[PDB]
């Protein structure tokens, strides 16, 4: 509870953001009179819809690496990248909605932020496994 | 293990439900002869497909707030909302499949249940951070 | 940290794989000149796109049962099924991309692997709840 409080905070933040994306899609459906089960129509809608879906399919990847990084590398560092990513995603959604081209900048920022969490998670896990493994390897060649 | 057993139970339940949604979509594909990579056809299919996809994109949001709420607020309360939500989602899927209109009632029930988890998670995290922060704020104005 | 290190490893692996699926879809978009917010075009593209989406909607189910199984049943066993599943998913993506029929074999392997995690998670949770419940049931009929 004490060692994961920040990660949980970022996580909740992330959820709130996804919730926001949804409300926006619901509003797009209304504005452009696009009723389910339809997911296609004017590009101005399709973009808003696609921005929400794209963010939704990366969320688990975010939550996953956020927690692994926070637990095996550094909680504060993992949480900071969590924010930077979450912010980049907001900018992505908002940009994408205006123009498909305006999604790129924010998309890249997201990748960089997400790739850090992955690199950190990797470095964390590596630090946890490698030593013990190398010692077991040496002990073997006794 | 002892402090999260209920959350894990609800979680497993949630997975089983998603698994159920999938089998249903697979059955829809068969019934309406809609082979991949197609995701469009008769509305009777599209609804079933969309019900499964909509539940799938909220699942992470569910799992996320379920665990944060269960860990920072109250496990039993978080687990109860987990059920209420999971049930609302079943009703959503089943309703949506019949009619796009029959998805609304259950959809709202889902939102309410999900919003609770978020409110609880928020209250939990707030209780964990606020005090320490306020004391640090006061100590500063010494 | 020590009791979940393998699960976190498999998890990170899983993320890396999803990241791989994405890059592939981005490459498909380029190859077949399919720019967002479009998600339809030549079947050779649609399959690649659908393979990535299908893997993305099961990921949370994977992560969920992976951790519940690893925590309530056996970490090493849960991690092994994690690999077997993750491998089956790679084979699924790669097969699907070539042909919709080549996705079936790997898809089934995925189901089997995933169903194990669910069975294990169930057995784990059952072992944690059942006894205490039965004793409470007997104590009642005192
Ligand atoms: C944190 C939770 C995520 C946030 C949960 C977001 C989803 C639940 C919110 C429902 C808002 C009204 Se849906 C709206 O409701 C209209 C009223 O009839 C329908 O007519 C519309 O078809 C329909 O789009
Ligand atoms: C290789 C790639 C390097 C990437 C850096 C990733 C940092 C993650 C661990 Se920080 C820190 O990394 C420390 C190691 O420098 C860990 O020492 C423990 O493990 C030691 C085993 O040698 C024990 O002797 C020692 O008592 C015990 O404290 C800490 O647990 C851990 O918090
Ligand atoms: C908990 C795990 C989630 C539950 C996992 C659910 C997915 C795996 C179950 C596969 C069932 C047969 Se797919 C069926 O298989 C047919 C047989 O050829 C194909 O012809 C169909 O195209 C195809 O739809
Ligand atoms: C503000 C919004 C309020 C929303 C309520 C959310 C409840 C979450 C914590 Se319940 C309960 O909330 C209790 C506080 O009433 C916490 O007391 C601890 O922290 C205290 C620090 O004052 C310590 O003095 C004390 O020894 C220590 O036990 C409990 O940890 C915690 O289980
Ligand atoms: C672990 C993280 C997951 C991995 C993150 C993967 C997503 C971020 C990587 C962006 C690669 C270039 Se997108 C490419 O960028 C092109 C350049 O203009 C655009 O023109 C294309 O429309 C556009 O597809
Ligand atoms: C019914 C379906 C069976 C499915 C098997 C799933 C295995 C999960 C628990 Se393994 C193992 O399963 C052991 C029970 O055989 C558990 O014993 C504890 O709980 C005992 C309560 O009787 C305590 O007396 C004992 O001190 C205490 O250690 C272990 O915690 C646990 O690691
Ligand atoms: N589901 C995504 C996976 C690949 C991806 O993330 N692509 C980036 C760069 S091409 C994107 O912003 N795609 C727009 C979208 O997914 O709607 C897709 O189909 O494009
Ligand atoms: N992916 C959803 C996000 C918004 C949402 O959850 N909408 C609710 C109320 S309009 C719904 O049931 N949508 C039907 C669906 O997603 O198929 C969408 O595109 O509609
Ligand atoms: N979202 C999936 C859920 C059902 C599913 O997983 N189906 C399997 C066997 S029919 C599959 O490989 N579907 C191809 C796909 O989802 O693109 C769908 O719409 O088919």
Numbering used by the authors:
A (entry chain A), B (entry chain A), C (entry chain A): 2 to 143
Paper excerpt:
LTC4S catalyzes the conjugation of glutathione (GSH) and leukotriene A4 (LTA4), which is an unsaturated fatty acid that is involved in eicosanoid biosynthesis. There are several defined DDM molecules per 17 kDa monomer of LTC4S and the biologically functional unit of LTC4S is a homotrimer. Dodecyl-β-d-selenomaltoside (SeDDM) is a seleno-detergent with a β-glycosidic seleno-ether in place of the ether moiety in dodecyl-β-d-maltoside. Crystals of a nuclear membrane-embedded enzyme, leukotriene C4 synthase (LTC4S), in complex with SeDDM were prepared and a multiwavelength anomalous diffraction (MAD) experiment was performed.
